[PDB]
């Protein structure tokens, strides 16, 4: 069926969830960016700290990778579950990263083509 | 650096880790035919080993 | 050479002799020249253990003795025939070592 | 079992607990008007360091802890 | 445990290749009798089992200084969830049954 980038964002976040990943914090962010094992990026609406967003832009410039900026990405990333073992402690996230490979080895999808067509522009 | 330092000294002559094969017990280990038990477990479990009393 | 040697060892003399009689009859069921069962000296294993778990009372010991009885049957035949005779529901506790030379 | 009476020196086996900033940037420099980076962090030949992991060199020896190397400039 | 999560999921996969194995009662044993030379500390093996004992979905039948693993359907479900994998990996013994 016809399935767009907005719906494909759920798919890419789910694929990231299956391989855990989803690097958080500030430290150890550009490990996969140097050797290009990650071929997809996600950004949230607006920003809270200019330092982080300008660092992310400068890093994308250092790696020649184009970002994707969407609206209400937080709910689409929360639908996949970020519990971190049961209701003990709370999650917190700002920028969604589908690090290390886009698609599963045994589970492909047509969303990859449209996501990358809107990702390489 | 304990990951590469773990188990540094080979304790081969001692039977702290080569004690009675049943439980955490020592003080009376016998190696006749390689039993590796104390007297307690051997005597209570000698019926299954095959050692009988007709002497 | 086709001299197949069964080194058969067990804890019970009667079970051992029943195994030997059945094997030598199965050889006697076929046309196979055989030798009589050769009885190597039984191994008597002694373990003298103090009885009281903590040293107290009169010095009392148990003497557990292990009698291991071993026969050999060397017959002039290919080992396949002996294996054909083998599938006879061998008695438990009787172990067979196969020697081919 | 009975008391061993830890009463003279510190009776503490707990590990370290430190407070610092949420945004700690020591692998890069900011407020530099430059998209590139002038490499003052030492190049690490280990296949476990990317662009997010580097080392800082002090006046005494060269520190390590990943592959046990030495870039000594004392 | 000062141990990476990826290795814990590797332990989960190696267990999921079967249904139950046994553990050696020792914390000084560098390796694992089943997972020999796979960087799996025995003390962390019993760490894993004691964690799922705290959860309450696994048990043991310890004997002769040897832990005897257990696994109930809810525990198998939890391991197949945290592995983030399909339940299709049934123990290979039924493929050799």
From Swiss-Prot, chain A:
Keywords: Acetylation, Cytoplasm, Nucleus, Ribonucleoprotein, Ribosomal protein. One of its GO terms (biological process) is positive regulation of canonical Wnt signaling pathway. One of its GO terms (cellular component) is cytosolic small ribosomal subunit. The modification N6-succinyllysine is found at residue 120. It holds the Pfam family Ribosomal_L7Ae. It is found in: Cytoplasm; Nucleus, Nucleolus. One of its GO terms (molecular function) is RNA binding. The keyword Methyltransferase does not apply. Belongs to the eukaryotic ribosomal protein eS12 family. Part of the small subunit (SSU) processome, composed of more than 70 proteins and the RNA chaperone small nucleolar RNA (snoRNA) U3. Subunit of the 40S ribosomal complex. Part of the small subunit (SSU) processome, first precursor of the small eukaryotic ribosomal subunit. During the assembly of the SSU processome in the nucleolus, many ribosome biogenesis factors, an RNA chaperone and ribosomal proteins associate with the nascent pre-rRNA and work in concert to generate RNA folding, modifications, rearrangements and cleavage as well as targeted degradation of pre-ribosomal RNA by the RNA exosome. Subunit of the 40S ribosomal complex. This is Small ribosomal subunit protein eS12. It comes from Homo sapiens (Human).
From Swiss-Prot, chain B:
PROSITE patterns: RIBOSOMAL_S14. The keyword Phosphoprotein applies. The modification Omega-N-methylarginine is found at residue 11. GO terms for molecular function: structural constituent of ribosome; zinc ion binding. GO terms for biological process: cytoplasmic translation; translation. It comes from the Eukaryota. InterPro entries: Ribosomal_uS14, Ribosomal_uS14_CS, RIbosomal_uS14_euk_arc, Ribosomal_uS14_sf. It is found in: Cytoplasm, Cytosol; Cytoplasm; Rough endoplasmic reticulum. Binds 1 zinc ion per subunit. The keyword Thylakoid does not apply. Component of the small ribosomal subunit. The ribosome is a large ribonucleoprotein complex responsible for the synthesis of proteins in the cell. NCBIfam families: PRK05766.1. Component of the 40S small ribosomal subunit. PANTHER family: 40S RIBOSOMAL PROTEIN S29, SMALL RIBOSOMAL SUBUNIT PROTEIN US14. This is Small ribosomal subunit protein uS14. It comes from Homo sapiens (Human).
From Swiss-Prot, chain D:
Changing residue 30 to R: Abolished monoubiquitination by RNF25, leading to impaired ability to rescue stalled ribosomes. It is found in: Cytoplasm; Nucleus, Nucleolus. A zinc finger (C4-type) spans 44-67. Residues 1-18 are annotated as: Disordered. The modification N6-acetyllysine is found at residues 27, 36. Monoubiquitinated at Lys-30 and Lys-36 by RNF25 in response to ribosome collisions (ribosome stalling): ubiquitination promotes subsequent activation of RNF14, leading to EEF1A1 ubiquitination and degradation and rescue of stalled ribosomes. Deubiquitination at Lys-36 by USP16 is required for maturation of the 40S ribosomal complex. There is a cross-link at residues 30, 36 (Glycyl lysine isopeptide (Lys-Gly) (interchain with G-Cter in ubiquitin)). Transmembrane segments: none annotated. Component of the 40S subunit of the ribosome. Part of the small subunit (SSU) processome, first precursor of the small eukaryotic ribosomal subunit. During the assembly of the SSU processome in the nucleolus, many ribosome biogenesis factors, an RNA chaperone and ribosomal proteins associate with the nascent pre-rRNA and work in concert to generate RNA folding, modifications, rearrangements and cleavage as well as targeted degradation of pre-ribosomal RNA by the RNA exosome. Part of the 40S ribosomal subunit. Part of the small subunit (SSU) processome, composed of more than 70 proteins and the RNA chaperone small nucleolar RNA (snoRNA) U3. This is Small ribosomal subunit protein eS31. It comes from Homo sapiens. The gene is RPS27A. The chain holds residues 78 to 151 of 156 of the full protein.
Curated annotation (Swiss-Prot), chain E:
Methylated by PRMT5. Methylation is necessary for its interaction with NPS1, its localization in the granular component (GC) region of the nucleolus, for the proper assembly of ribosomes, protein synthesis and optimal cell proliferation. The modification Phosphotyrosine is found at residue 12. GO terms for biological process: cytoplasmic translation; translation. One of its GO terms (molecular function) is RNA binding. Keywords: Cytoplasm, Diamond-Blackfan anemia, Isopeptide bond, Methylation, Nucleus, Phosphoprotein, Ribonucleoprotein, Ribosomal protein, Ubl conjugation. One of its GO terms (cellular component) is cytoplasm. It is found in: Cytoplasm; Nucleus, Nucleolus. Belongs to the eukaryotic ribosomal protein eS10 family. Component of the 40S ribosomal subunit. The ribosome is a large ribonucleoprotein complex responsible for the synthesis of proteins in the cell. Component of the small ribosomal subunit. The methylated form interacts with NPM1. This is Small ribosomal subunit protein eS10. The chain holds residues 1 to 97 of 165 of the full protein.
